[PDB]
Structures are given as structure tokens and as C-alpha cells.
């Protein structure tokens, strides 16, 4: 009467941190 | 003059430290008992090794090193080895139970017991220095004691000193070979906690060193001995600019000034050339241009990856020995002309060069043939993004079922730490993907 | 430094541990008088992990002998190495268990456990840094099973942060030696799965198969099977005693080898194994040791591992070797037989290398495998136990010791849940 | 480097291969202890192609012995060179085949083939570069025939890209030694033509004729016939072991000698062959070897090659020679006897020269011929088999092992088709 | 100054390379260990052998060669022979299974496994050169490894470099003598794939060398030794114009400029004279005119064919040693006057001449008597069209029944390749027939 | 019940490739 501990894992939406485009304008 | 403290953490740290200090004692002519066979000057002079060896008593040189581990066996092996009478007895700090490849242990449970003693010894060593410039930390990501205690010590040192440079030499988890089942978690947690506190961490790979040994050195059974010797050669070539006068000297700050374009991308790949066996040494004419060209061959990377899959952001060429600057100029021009090597568009000046007069020295009983010139190269390329993605994929595969998670959770590692580390690693991958896009 | 308290319980305990201490005293140059007469400094460098030094160059093995009838202890005391053991640690009863787990756990063990635990505390307080407890015992044996379960529970309560390792002799798939072995095994695992950190499953039948097949032995004895088990035990903790290129203590093995808290049973193996005549025709290389380790006929457990998949693999090597060689062999193993490893664990193999080879060998290797195939053992035990319990087979012998039907029911239910967990973790899920 | 796994099966297998390993150990300076005591570096330069080195200067021949009754293996083990073979590779049954191909292929071989294939895999994984498999066996023998067909099928499935060479003892045209030899031969070729790369046909009767006629022997033994066959076998693979002016491995022979996939049977020959007294009156020149090779009385196959035509001719020479001399002799042979070669193959002769002569000879040469004349063997076998099958001669002995009439029918039909193919390729067509 | 890379492929390639490098070391006075017994100049000068031998270390000369084979026995024989300490260990590349005289294997299946390593070594050797002019490839048509791997390497080199000259010395299949049954298919496939990627392939024949040895050298048992020595003499006479200063020097490009009238007809026949034994050397006065006349005798052709059956399109006369240009002028005028030798009408200027001062050198223990002058002649004639037709006829005879075809088809050689090769060979025969018609 | 695999082989009509007559006019 057991069930495996499986979780739905996702890194859904991760943005970059280095502002490599901040001076693109 | 200038000073640098070498910190060796964990199994790989202490072993690489043994190799490195053997090589230093060979280069500077320092006997295993701290004495000099040509002890004609005592307590000063140049004698440029004042950076790595402090002057005590009368004619005894003491290395500025701190060996830390939670498992006393390797430190005891140091305490009974050839250099047992070289190191100061107060430089060898031991716990009584290693971290069992559990980052949580070495970071929270066991590391907190000796971190204060380690920091006190580091402060005592640094207070004896006048031009302290950098800290060298040797550790492996997979090793729990190395990983966890290194993360803790890096945080503590970043808090205590702040403006001193922090360089790391670390063994990246091999893409195929592994020694611990929980290397993904330890690696991900250590990277997440270490990223913003390190100036430059140099990547090496034992599998790449296996391939290099087999192909170039013609050695079928290269145990950790040859690996440690090659790593020590690389470290010595990096520190030779401080230790010996060169035609173009390079301090330690210039490395992070030239190799780190963004504060979050500071993982250059180490290479080394020439690496030839003594048998083919007499069928080869090692010119400057040939070594420079061999440095950029994908088969000579100390990290198993394909540099052709990404682009270079910065490359540092450190030459040693009989080196003519005109030949280096022409070789760099030729390398830039080679259309198979791509650099990021936003870095039109992608090379930094340094030339030191001191030629490399071969350890007696070693593997490499003696050469009149050698080149240590350090390159920051976007090719390691694929290795980061592989590590993140392995972490996801193991974490979707919470495999090994109870071991970390029991030590106080709250579960949300893994989610935070995973999101931060995804952000690092996004950073690499964004910086590699031309405009 | 790190110290290991070896607890011997039952007939398996006493015999296997007598052979084990013979082997350990041989490795460290300790003659049957306790005086050190070795030839290398590494023998005394880590002599304190299994020995206490009483001034006079005499070393006492940190072992505790437990039994419920003095016959086996008399046989041990009068045999070889009798005088090295300090006679303080021969703690025995008088009634015996009669192979009844209920008796040995609730009456005789309940009477003797106070003395046994006082001896345990005496040996533990004298330690410098207690690392873990090693227990040698059988499951079918009433003394072994009951006394071991009771002692493991009490010591786990006493030291919840130490390593609890057990080397258990499990029931054989064909030839059982005890009528009430299934009930003893069920009630034993019902506590082992809760209190122990890791358990190594040894089957005597697999050892007989290895002896007749590989070693070409015609008259194998329980003592020679104990020699094999003792070689395995010495290979397990070679990193706690001698230096090497890559060391691994007991906690490192427990961390790398137990993915989930309840799936801690392991299948041990050993290499190399050759007959005396065939020694002159086979070279000792790392590929040879690797092929002997990952072989179904060399598994000391009563199960063909090719029926399930592995979760974690530990391979501790002894002797001067090339790490590149070992790593390439492990890569070849994982690549050619990828279907035998669970998809949710990349890098299934853990490795370690000690520089000191066993006596008389250039190189060796100890195998430790965590395979889902071991569910066959627990399923067969559950089937036999259920069939016996439906008819209340020998049930009065246990109900007379204080047990009710509810304890058997809970033990069987937990066993079914453990089998179901092993079956659940065979799903790739990705 | 390239390695050859020699598989011995049947009485022919065991005896011929014992003599073969005697000859090979003599050529490489390996004494009956396995220790190298030779006198030239070339003996160890390519010692690994047939030997495994176990540290201690001992070399183990990479051979696998297969049989269904331990008598022949006991005779081999107790005789000369018994202790060099590592005893791991004596894989035998207990029932024997009784010369019944059906038995040895479906029951006894079916029981023993798992162990035999495990040994094969063990020897193959230890290789550096597996090149091909050599099988020595008889066709009339039930053990040889059945076990060889089963093993060849299984190994061909296991390694489809390796060279499968067999040296088969074929039925004699006049004196048969087994009552059920025709059925065994038919059912054997029905699988050999499908799974093997090339088969060398040896007849004992032709060897007897050569022994009484050329060597002037009065009491020839099966062992001396095995000596001749072993000299041929050593001459076949001399390029895999020693350098020379022009080398040719086994795959080169298979490519140059098999024009179409089903016509892979070859007739072997050997030169020089002289009696002891006549040695003092004949010089050893390349014309002499060439005339001895292309001689009907020197063919070890049970057929006069002058009745058909050749498709491919292989001539491997040993010893210091002039390539101009050999090429001129081959030109003379092809020009004077052009009517014995098929018109649709120009340049019928393949050549190779090894610089190391056999023990005691200045020069020698091994003949390998692919002639359409061998259709006589297959036609006689088909006629005898049909005559026996019309009356169901001994048919129950095979139907009791699981065979039906359809298997015999398909075997006979395939045999008739093979004979018809050989007859088809005798047409000049141009 | 100028440089040329010598590539040896297959059995015949490696054996002829052994002979050639022995002859070069004899001519330049280079000891078997790369040292010079008169080592007075190190690392430069003239010392004109800088073309073939690179300067490494101090006093060690390293030949610019690459030995490739799929069967390791002959390369190991090189690795344990007299010149094992001469060649660089990285110059010897081996597979582990030769092509079994199957062009399909060496071209598709096995050659693709080491072609990348061979090309990388070739690039490493070429990057050390400054005036690289040509590539020398030694191979036999019949040999599978030679044939297939040579076709593959020729395609790859033609793609990679393009404008560097590509000269081949190859053993044409003998008209009567053969060593492999499948020589027609391998030869036809190799020719079809190699035609448009070679600048000039020089033809030799072992049967013609047998006849030459027996008639001129008076040797009854001339094994591959004498064949290789004669081939090495021819190769050395061809390269002497680069290696030594002459009265009229000839580079490598002039050969394909003067000998190739049409892009598809580039198969000149090699000859050599004088070839005399030491016994008749003292009964002979070897003048320039006599050697020039003997060069055009049909009995001295290195390829078994009748030059009187066709016409000459171009003839190159390379003289060595004590040679007077006036005598060469008069001898060429006499040869043109000789009405038995026919040249194509569209080539009124059919001779190219070169005179080098260096006389030929005899190998100790050799067969040829020492002469003060020798002439190596290379002639492109339409007489080889009959040999091409013979090869095509043998190919048709074997292919009408699909003999040996399954061996090639299994390796991935699609059947249409044989039809394409046959049509291309028929087109080559048509080219020869058309260029040989006057107007 | 077999037949030899004989094919009717012909290089029917093959033209030259070198334009040796292109400037004949
Ligand atoms: N190149 C090289 N790598 C090493 C050496 N020693 C250990 N390693 C690497 O270190 C990794 C394991 O981490 P360790 O350093 O051994 O472990 P640790 O730092 O002692 O920390 P713990 O896990 O608590 O034992 C392995 O993957 C090895 O590849 C060495 O001497 N040379
Ligand atoms: N003149 C001369 N010819 C040779 C020599 N060695 C081999 N040959 C010729 O080479 C032809 C056979 O091809 P090989 O070069 O031996 O074969 P390979 O290049 O090794 O390729 P494989 O077929 O795969 O073995 C024969 O017809 C010989 O005439 C040599 O030393 N001298
Ligand atoms: N390997 C091994 N197994 C043993 C030995 N002695 C007994 N056994 C096993 O242990 C079981 C007997 O249980 P035992 O411990 O003697 O009874 P207890 O008094 O109730 O503990 C049998 O199944 C035996 O197979 C031994 O010396 N070696
Ligand atoms: N050349 C040779 N032939 C043999 C030898 N022994 C047996 N034979 C032949 O093999 C046949 C016997 O078959 P055999 O293999 O012994 O029976 P099996 O047990 O069914 O395999 C007979 O026709 C013999 O002529 C031998 O030592 N040398
Ligand atoms: Mg550690
Ligand atoms: Mg070859």
C-alpha cells in the first residue's frame, strides 16, 4: 500500500542576471 | 614583496598541495627540511620566493600554506611523508569525521566546528604578510568536505577580507567518470553558494587528464600521481609571474581583470603545452608558434568539452623560458586569423599575454621531457555552458524523485535550498546563452 | 581516531567473527598473544580502530561476544586466539533461544541485554572517536535474530548519530536449516528496516555454489565460508585502517549507497576468486577484477541480479592500481549494461582505492551492490511466512513468549510494503 | 593486436588441436610449462595473437575445449602440454552424442552451449582486437557436427562482423567410419553453408594416401595425420604472427578466395612432403614447391581437381624466397594449365610470402584451392543421403530428438541447390 | 627553402618509403639516429635537405614523412628496424585491421576511422613548413588499404589545400603477374575516384622491374629489395633538382606544367638509365649520348608496355652528375631525328630537360655500379591506353557475373559505383584514342 | 533449382571528355 515519491519538477521561467543587453540601446 | 596564501581543502586539495609544494621546493632549491643547499642569504633578499615561504629562525623556509580536512588520514600522510619537517605543525588542521560526500555536513554540521580555527590560522598567517594579494583554494566539487567546507570558508573569507583576490583551482565533475553517486547535489549546492564569492575558479577534469596522459605522455597507467603533477605544473606556471622576473610580468589581479567580462561568468578553462614524453622529445623542434598552436587544439583541454561548440570571451597566454615576443605576436595574429576559433563580437581584443624568463623545471622521476619553453593558457569560453546544462540535467533527474535528499535534509539542509540552487544554475545557463549571442 | 565496536551475537556471530579476528590479527601482525610482531608501520598507524592497547605491547580487539548458551563461547575461548581477547567481554546466558525469536527477544535477551549494554557503554566510553557499530549475526537463528534486534534498538536509542552496520546471514532459497526460520526472519527484518543503517545479505547456499564452482572445493566447511565473509568484511573497512589514493569511510558508503532510508540492503561480492591450480594461468588485472565482480555467479546473495536493476554500486579496490584503468572499466560496465541500472540515477558506481592489498594478492576488489532484484528474497520470505501463518504453524511457541497475532500481522504488512517499495522503484518514470 | 579464438570440438577437434598447440608452442618457444624459453624476438612479437600472458612469464593458449563426454578431455589433460592450458576452458558434458547430430544439436548441445558461450565471451572480452574464430571439428562425428553447428550459429549471431573459419574432416569416398555419417554431414553443411565464412575440407583417406605414397610411412597414426593438418593450420596463419615481404591476414584470404557467398569451401594442400631417405636427393626450390602444390596426389581433399576448374587459388609461402621466382612459377602454372581455370576470373592465383620458414625446412608453401571439382563430394553425399532416406534408414534415432521429416527435406534440397550452383559456375559463358 | 611532405600508404607505400629514406640518409650523410657525422651546422644553412628533414633539438634531423597503414605489422617493422630512432613516433599511424584488398573497406568503413588523425598530423607537419610545394603519395592500386585510404586521403587533401601539387608514385597492376584476385575492381574504383584529384601519378610495374633486374643487373633472385631500391633511385633522381643545385634546376610544378597536356591524361611512365651490374661496369664507357639513347629503348621501361604502339606527348629528361649541356642538346636532337619514336603532331616541342650537378650515390651492398652520370626520364605516352583497355576488359569479365561484388556491396559500396567507374574508364580510353589522332 | 547470375554488360556509347577538337575549327 505504497506509492513512489515522484514529483513534477520544473524550472519554469528563469531570466538571465547579467545585464548584457542593458546598453544595447 | 607580494604574498599569497595557499589553502588546501579536502582529499584532492591536500594531494594537489603535496604535488605543488614538491614542485616549488624543486624550483626554488629548497630542501625537504626547509633548508637551502646554497643557504648563502638568510631572512631576506631576492630570493623572490618570500611570497610563498616565510623566513624563520636562520636558514629555514616555511611555506605559507594551510591544510584543512575533516578526515585525518591524508593530513597524517603529509605528517609522515617527505615534507613532514618542512611544514609548520600548526598549519595542519584536522577534524575527526569527514563529510561523507554530503555538502550539508561539511557546510553546516561539521564545518562549523573547525571553521573558526581555520580562520584564526589564516588570520595569523596573513598578519605576517605585508603585500598579501590573493588566496588560493584547492578543492573538488564532488568531495563533501572539500565542497561544503570550501563554500563555508569562501563565504567567511569574502566577509573578512573582501578586497583580496580569491582564486580557486577545482576539479570539475567529469562528464562520464564519477567517484560519488551524490556528486550532482554537492556540485550544484557548492556552485550556488560559491558563485558570487569567487573572483576566478579554474576548471580541470580528471577524465581530460587521463586522455591527455594516454595521448601525449604515452603512459598507460597514469594514477593520481600524473594528474597531480600536471596540475602542479599549471599552478606553478600561473604563479611564476610573481615568483620570477619576466619580460612582461602579470600580477594576480590582472587575471580577473582580463578574464571576467561579467561578475557571474568567471570559470576559465586551463590548458598546458607542450606535454611530450621523453621518447619523442628528440624528434621534435618545440618552437613558440608550434606550442601556441597546440594550446588551442581541443585535444589538449584540461576540461572535457568541445571549445568549437562555443565562443571565446578572453584568453590569457602565459609563456615561460626562451620566448621571443615577436614570435608570440605573430602566433597570436595567426590564431586570430584562424577562422575555426570564434570569439564573442563584443570582445575585439580577446588576448592577454605574459612572458616570464624562468623556464619550466621537470621533477626528477617525472613524465614530461625537459623543454626550454612552455605555455600555460587560461581561456574563458562559452563551451562550458554545455557541461553546466549536463550537471543541471543530472541534478533534475536525481531530484525529481528526491534521491539522497533525506541525507542532506537531516543535517539541517532545508529543502528549499535545492530549489534555490536549481533556479540559480538555470540563471547561470541563461547568462551563458545570452552573452554568446552576437548583435 | 575513528573506532569500530564489533558486536558478535549468535553462532554465525561467534564463528564468523572468530575467523574475522583471525584475519584482522594477521593483517596487523598481531600474534595469538596480542603482542605486536609485524613488519610495517602502517599496521600500528591505525591499530586503534579495532584494538585497545594495554601497556606492555599487548593489543585487545574491541569486540563484544554475545550468546544465550556458553557452548559456542567455550569453543571460541579454547580455540586459536583465545588469550588475546580480554575475558571481560564474554557475556552469555544459560537457557539458549531454541531458534525462537520471541524467546530471545522478550525473555532471555530481556534478561541479558542490561549486561550486554553495560559492556557496550564501557567499550564506547574508552573510545577516542566512536564511528560505528558492526554486528555479525544470522537471521534464522533465534539467538542471533532476537538478541541482535534488541541490541540494535537499544544502541540506536543510545547513539542515534552513529553508523549501525550489520552483516546478516539470510535464509537460503532452497535449503532451510531451521523450521521456524521464516518467522524469525520476518520479525527480524521488521526491526532491522527501522533501526539499522545498512545490512549486507550473506547466503550460505551462494557461498556453497561459489566454493564448489569457482574455488573447486570438494569439502568446504562453515569455517571457509567464514573466511570468505571475513575477507569481505576486511575489504569493507580497509580505508579506516590504511591510506590510499582514494579513501571512503563507513558513513561515505552509507551516504553514497542508500538512496532512500528504507532501501538499505546490499548484495556483497568479492574478487579475485580462483582455485589453487588455476592461479598459474590467469593474470591479475583491473579488467579481470571488474569482470569477476559484475558476475551473477560471484554474488554472495541468493538472487540473480540480472532480474532487476541496480540503484547504487560500490567498488572498493585494494593494491597498487591505475585510477584511469578502474574508471575506464567502470565506464565500460555502465555503458555496455545500461539496461541494468535505474534511469533516475546517473553515475551509478562509487569507487575507492586502498594501497594495501590483501595478504598474498597483488590486487583485489570488494563489491557492494544495491539492486532491486533483492525483492525476490523478501517476496519469497513473505510467501512462505504467509503460507505458514495461515495454518498457525508453530504459532504457540511464539505466543507463549508474550507475542500476539497483531505483532506478526504488522511484521508481515511492513514486509509487503517493503517489497512494494522495491517494486515501485523499478519504474523508469522518465 | 589481432587475436584468434581457437574452439576445439569433438574427437577430431581435441586431437587435431592438441597436435596443433604442440606445433604452435614449438614455433614460439613455449615449453610444456607455459614459460617462454625461445631464442628470437619474433616469437614474442606476436605471441598475443594465440596466447594470453599471465604475469610470471607464463603464456596461456587462447583455446576452448568442447566435448560431450570427458574421456577425450581427460586424455588431453593428462598428456603432453596438459598444464599450460588454464583449466578454466575444459567445458564438457556427460552423455555424449552417440554420433547422432540431432542429439548433439538439440539436447546435449542445447544444455552445454550456455557454458560454452560464456567461456567464449570471457575469452573475447579479454582480447585487444578480436579478428576471427577458428573451429576444428569433424562432420561425421555427432559431437563435432552438432555442437559445431550450434556454436557457429550462436557466435555468428553474437559477432556478425568477425571471421568464422572452420577446419572440417569430411566423409571419405570409400571407407566411412560412422553408419549415420551421411545424415550428420548433410545436416551439418545445411548450417555451415549459411553461417560460416570458409571451410577447409580434410579427408582422412587422402591423408592416408599421402602418408603411404609420399612419406613412405608404413604405420601412420591419427596423430601423424593431425601433424600434417597442424602444419597446414600453422601455414595458414603465419602472416598473423611473423613479418614478411607480403603478408595476408584471414580476412584478405576470405575476400580473395570466396567469389560468391555460398561457394566458400576450399581444398588445402601442403609442400614440401618427402620421406626421410629421399631428403638427401631433392633440392628445395620454388619450382619444386610449386609442382608439389599443384599436384592431384598432394591434395588433402577427397577429389581429383583435374575433373573441374578452379575459381581462386591461394599460395602462402614460408622462408626466404625471390618474389620474381614465385611470380614466374605462378605465370607458368596459369599459362600451361589454363583449361583448369574459369574463364570469367583473370589472375586466378593469390600469393603471400612469410619470411619465417617452418621448423627444419629452408622453404615451404601452403596451398588453398577453390575448385568446382569439390561438387563430387557434395554430389556423392547427396546420393548416399537420398538412398538412405528413401528407406528411412536410422530415421527414428533422429526423430526421437525432435527432428521431423521437413528438416531433412530442406537440408537435402539445399544440398542439391549447392551442387547445382557449383555446376552452374563451370560454364565459361564467354 | 622549399618543402615537400612524403606520405606512405599501405604495404608498398611503407616499404618504398623505407628504401627512399635509407637512400636520402645516405645521400645527405644523415646517420640512422638523425645525427650527422659531420654535424658542424645545426638548425639551418644549406644543408639543402631542409625540405625533407626538419631541424629539432640540436643536431637531430627529422624526416618530413607520414606513414599510414591499417595493418600494424609493417609499421612495427619500421618501429623496430634500423631507422626506428630516426622517425618521430607521432609520424607512424596504425589501424587494427587492413582492408583485405577491398577498396570499399579502406575507402568507407575503416579509412573513415583514422583519416581525421592522418589529416591532423599532415596539417601539423605542413604548418611547420614555409614553402610547402608538393605532396608525395606512395601506394599500390591493388592493395586495398593503399587503394581505398589513398583515394580518401587524396580527396581530403585536394579539398583542404587545393593549390599544392599532388604527385603520386604508384605500382600499376602488372599485365601478367598479380597478387590479389580482386585487383581489377580495386584498381578501377581507385582510378575513377582519384583521376580528377591528382596532378601527376607516376607509373611503375613489378614485372617490368623483374625483367630489368634479370637483363641488366644479372640478378636471378631480385626480391622486393631490388625493386624498392630501383624505385628509391628514381624518386631520389626526381627530388634531386630541389635538393641540390644544378645547371638547369626544375621545381615540382614544372613537371605537371610540361607533362600534362589535358587535365585527364596525367600518367607518365618512369624509366631509369644507366642500370648496369658492377661486373660489366669496367667494359663500358657511359657517355651522355649512350645513356640518352638507352633511356628510350622499350626494354628499359618501368611499366610493361610497348611505347612503339603509341605516341609521346611529353618527355622530361633529368640528368645528374658529370653532364655537359651540349651533349644533351645533341642527344635530344638525335632522339628527335630517330624516326622510330613518334610524337603527337600537336606537340612540336616535346622535350623538357633538367641537369643537376649531384651525381647518383650507390647504396652500400647495393646492386648498381657507381656511375659519374645518370638520367631519370619521365614520359607521357599513349601506349598506356592498351594497359587501360586490358584492365577494363578484366573488370568487365569479372563484373558480368558480379564476382566478388557482394564483398564490396556489404561495406556500403552501392552497385551503381561500379557502373559509374566503368563508364569513366571507357571515357578515359576514349580520351587517349582521341588525343592520339593527328589532323 | 538455381541459375547462374549472368548479366548482359555493356559500355554502350561513351564519348570523350577532353575537348581536343574544340579548337579544330
Ligand atoms: N586530479 C586529481 N583529482 C582528485 C585527486 N584526489 C581526489 N580527486 C577528485 O576528487 C573527487 C572526490 O572528492 P574528494 O576530494 O576525494 O573528497 P573530499 O574533498 O575529501 O571530501 P569528502 O567527500 O568528504 O571526502 C573525485 O572525483 C576525484 O576526481 C587527485 O589526487 N588528483
Ligand atoms: N615494387 C614493389 N611492389 C610492392 C611492394 N610491396 C607490395 N607491392 C605491390 O603491392 C601490391 C599489393 O598491394 P599492397 O601494397 O601489398 O597492399 P596494401 O597497400 O597493404 O593494402 P591491403 O590490400 O589492404 O593489404 C602487389 O601487387 C605488389 O606488387 C614492394 O615492396 N615493392
Ligand atoms: N556462514 C555460516 N553460517 C552459519 C554458521 N553456523 C550457522 N550458520 C547458519 O545459521 C543458521 C543457524 O542459526 P543459529 O545462529 O546457529 O541459531 P541461534 O542459536 O538461534 O542463533 C543456519 O541456517 C546456518 O546456515 C557458520 O559458521 N557460517
Ligand atoms: N584426421 C583425424 N580424423 C579423426 C581422428 N579421430 C577421429 N577422426 C575421424 O572422425 C570421425 C569420428 O567422429 P567423432 O568426432 O570421433 O565422433 P563424435 O563423438 O560424434 O564427434 C571418423 O570418421 C574418423 O575418421 C583424428 O585423430 N584425426
Ligand atoms: Mg575525504
Ligand atoms: Mg596490407
CSV table of C-alpha atoms in Angstrom, one decimal, chain B residues 119-271:
chain,number,residue,atom,x,y,z
B,119,UNK,CA,40.1,31.3,10.0
B,120,UNK,CA,42.2,32.1,13.1
B,121,UNK,CA,45.2,30.3,11.5
B,122,UNK,CA,44.6,32.1,8.2
B,123,UNK,CA,44.5,35.5,10.0
B,124,UNK,CA,47.7,34.7,11.9
B,125,UNK,CA,49.4,33.8,8.5
B,126,UNK,CA,48.0,36.9,6.8
B,127,UNK,CA,49.1,39.3,9.6
B,128,UNK,CA,52.7,38.2,8.9
B,129,UNK,CA,52.4,39.4,5.3
B,130,UNK,CA,52.8,42.9,4.0
B,131,UNK,CA,51.7,42.7,0.4
B,132,UNK,CA,49.1,40.0,0.6
B,133,UNK,CA,47.3,39.9,-2.8
B,134,UNK,CA,45.4,36.6,-3.2
B,135,UNK,CA,44.1,33.4,-1.7
B,136,UNK,CA,44.5,30.0,-3.5
B,137,UNK,CA,41.9,27.4,-2.6
B,138,UNK,CA,42.3,23.8,-3.9
B,139,UNK,CA,39.2,21.6,-3.7
B,140,UNK,CA,36.9,19.3,-5.7
B,141,UNK,CA,33.2,19.9,-6.2
B,142,UNK,CA,32.2,16.2,-5.6
B,143,UNK,CA,34.1,15.8,-2.3
B,144,UNK,CA,31.8,16.6,0.6
B,145,UNK,CA,34.5,18.0,2.9
B,146,UNK,CA,36.1,19.9,0.0
B,147,UNK,CA,32.7,21.2,-1.3
B,148,UNK,CA,31.0,22.1,2.0
B,149,UNK,CA,33.9,23.4,3.9
B,150,UNK,CA,35.2,25.3,0.9
B,151,UNK,CA,31.8,27.0,0.5
B,152,UNK,CA,31.8,27.9,4.2
B,153,UNK,CA,35.4,29.2,4.1
B,154,UNK,CA,34.8,31.1,0.9
B,155,UNK,CA,31.9,32.9,2.5
B,156,UNK,CA,33.9,33.6,5.7
B,157,UNK,CA,37.0,34.9,3.8
B,158,UNK,CA,34.8,37.1,1.5
B,159,UNK,CA,33.3,38.6,4.6
B,160,UNK,CA,36.6,39.1,6.5
B,161,UNK,CA,38.9,40.5,3.8
B,162,UNK,CA,36.7,41.5,0.9
B,163,UNK,CA,39.2,43.2,-1.3
B,164,UNK,CA,41.8,40.4,-1.5
B,165,UNK,CA,41.6,38.3,-4.7
B,166,UNK,CA,40.2,34.8,-4.3
B,167,UNK,CA,41.4,32.3,-6.9
B,168,UNK,CA,40.2,28.7,-7.0
B,169,UNK,CA,41.7,25.6,-8.7
B,170,UNK,CA,38.9,22.9,-8.7
B,171,UNK,CA,38.3,19.6,-10.3
B,172,UNK,CA,35.1,19.8,-12.3
B,173,UNK,CA,32.9,16.7,-12.2
B,174,UNK,CA,33.8,14.6,-15.2
B,175,UNK,CA,31.1,14.1,-17.8
B,176,UNK,CA,31.4,10.3,-17.8
B,177,UNK,CA,33.7,9.3,-14.9
B,178,UNK,CA,32.4,9.7,-11.3
B,179,UNK,CA,33.6,8.7,-7.9
B,180,UNK,CA,30.5,9.5,-5.8
B,181,UNK,CA,26.8,9.0,-6.5
B,182,UNK,CA,25.8,12.3,-5.0
B,183,UNK,CA,28.2,14.4,-7.0
B,184,UNK,CA,25.4,16.4,-8.7
B,185,UNK,CA,23.8,17.7,-5.5
B,186,UNK,CA,27.2,18.6,-3.9
B,187,UNK,CA,28.3,20.3,-7.1
B,188,UNK,CA,25.1,22.2,-7.6
B,189,UNK,CA,24.9,23.4,-4.0
B,190,UNK,CA,28.6,24.4,-3.9
B,191,UNK,CA,28.3,26.3,-7.1
B,192,UNK,CA,25.2,28.1,-6.0
B,193,UNK,CA,26.8,29.2,-2.7
B,194,UNK,CA,30.2,29.9,-4.2
B,195,UNK,CA,29.4,31.8,-7.4
B,196,UNK,CA,29.2,35.4,-6.1
B,197,UNK,CA,32.1,35.0,-3.6
B,198,UNK,CA,34.8,33.9,-6.0
B,199,UNK,CA,36.9,36.1,-8.3
B,200,UNK,CA,38.1,33.3,-10.7
B,201,UNK,CA,37.8,29.5,-10.4
B,202,UNK,CA,40.0,27.5,-12.8
B,203,UNK,CA,38.4,24.3,-14.1
B,204,UNK,CA,40.2,20.9,-14.5
B,205,UNK,CA,39.0,17.4,-15.3
B,206,UNK,CA,40.5,14.1,-14.4
B,207,UNK,CA,39.0,12.4,-17.5
B,208,UNK,CA,40.6,15.0,-19.7
B,209,UNK,CA,43.9,14.5,-17.9
B,210,UNK,CA,43.5,10.7,-18.5
B,211,UNK,CA,43.1,11.3,-22.2
B,212,UNK,CA,46.0,13.8,-22.2
B,213,UNK,CA,48.3,11.4,-20.4
B,214,UNK,CA,47.4,8.5,-22.8
B,215,UNK,CA,47.7,10.5,-26.0
B,216,UNK,CA,50.7,12.8,-25.3
B,217,UNK,CA,52.7,11.2,-22.4
B,218,UNK,CA,52.3,7.6,-23.8
B,219,UNK,CA,51.5,6.4,-20.2
B,220,UNK,CA,49.0,3.5,-19.9
B,221,UNK,CA,48.6,3.6,-16.1
B,222,UNK,CA,48.6,7.3,-15.0
B,223,UNK,CA,47.2,7.2,-11.5
B,224,UNK,CA,46.6,10.4,-9.4
B,225,UNK,CA,50.3,10.9,-9.5
B,226,UNK,CA,50.5,12.1,-13.1
B,227,UNK,CA,47.3,14.1,-12.6
B,228,UNK,CA,48.7,15.9,-9.6
B,229,UNK,CA,52.0,16.6,-11.3
B,230,UNK,CA,50.3,18.2,-14.3
B,231,UNK,CA,48.0,20.3,-12.1
B,232,UNK,CA,51.1,21.4,-10.1
B,233,UNK,CA,52.8,22.3,-13.4
B,234,UNK,CA,49.8,24.5,-14.3
B,235,UNK,CA,49.7,26.2,-10.9
B,236,UNK,CA,53.5,26.8,-10.9
B,237,UNK,CA,53.2,28.4,-14.4
B,238,UNK,CA,50.5,30.6,-13.1
B,239,UNK,CA,52.5,31.8,-10.1
B,240,UNK,CA,55.8,32.1,-11.9
B,241,UNK,CA,54.9,35.6,-13.0
B,242,UNK,CA,55.0,36.6,-9.3
B,243,UNK,CA,57.9,34.4,-8.4
B,244,UNK,CA,60.3,35.3,-11.2
B,245,UNK,CA,61.1,38.4,-13.2
B,246,UNK,CA,59.7,38.3,-16.8
B,247,UNK,CA,59.8,40.4,-19.9
B,248,UNK,CA,56.1,41.1,-19.3
B,249,UNK,CA,55.0,40.5,-15.7
B,250,UNK,CA,51.4,39.7,-14.7
B,251,UNK,CA,50.1,40.1,-11.2
B,252,UNK,CA,47.1,38.2,-9.8
B,253,UNK,CA,44.6,41.0,-10.2
B,254,UNK,CA,45.2,41.2,-14.0
B,255,UNK,CA,43.7,37.7,-14.3
B,256,UNK,CA,40.3,38.6,-13.0
B,257,UNK,CA,40.5,42.0,-14.8
B,258,UNK,CA,41.1,40.3,-18.2
B,259,UNK,CA,39.2,37.0,-17.9
B,260,UNK,CA,35.9,38.1,-16.2
B,261,UNK,CA,33.6,40.0,-18.5
B,262,UNK,CA,30.6,39.7,-16.3
B,263,UNK,CA,30.6,39.2,-12.5
B,264,UNK,CA,28.8,35.8,-12.8
B,265,UNK,CA,31.0,34.3,-15.6
B,266,UNK,CA,34.4,33.6,-14.1
B,267,UNK,CA,35.1,29.9,-15.0
B,268,UNK,CA,38.1,29.9,-17.3
B,269,UNK,CA,39.4,26.6,-18.6
B,270,UNK,CA,43.1,25.6,-18.0
B,271,UNK,CA,45.3,24.2,-20.7
